[PDB]
Design a protein around this ligand. Structure first.
Ligand SMILES: COc1cc(C(N)=O)ccc1NC(=O)[C@@H]1N[C@@H](CC(C)(C)C)[C@@]2(C(=O)Nc3cc(Cl)sc32)[C@H]1c1cccc(Cl)c1F
Length: 85
């Protein structure tokens, strides 16, 4: 319901994934990040539901080599740090 404004980096990635506006609802951010991840194929079975983003700008976005898609509080947290408002 609330609209959030992404930082330039998170923005360039969302657009690159299909987004066509510069403010979103959290659900939209997650939706597009999902597509980005599927696109650049950073998610794998095996693993343990892990996104490997060590050579990707997403890794710089979130500041990690990888993460579990299974703990939403962390993800929302890594995302909130890239929300300008
Ligand atoms: C197959 O997918 C899973 C499998 C398992 C499992 N243990 O079997 C757990 C979890 C998932 N997936 C997910 O939660 C949800 N699937 C992820 C997408 C993905 C392509 C990685 C499968 C997820 C999503 O939908 N957008 C998004 C953006 C991220 Cl950065 S991450 C993520 C997860 C997610 C959904 C809703 C809210 C949040 Cl905060 C969230 F992080």
């Amino acid at each position: 319901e609330k609209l959030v404004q992404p930082t330039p980096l998170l923005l360039s990635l969302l657009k690159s994934a299909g987004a066509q506006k510069e403010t979103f609802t959290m659900k939209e951010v997650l939706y597009h990040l999902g597509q980005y991840i599927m696109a650049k194929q950073l998610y794998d079975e095996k693993q343990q539901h892990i996104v490997h983003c060590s050579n990707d700008p997403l890794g710089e976005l979130f500041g990690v080599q990888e993460f579990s898609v299974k703990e939403h509080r962390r993800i929302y947290a890594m995302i909130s740090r890239n929300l300008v408002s």
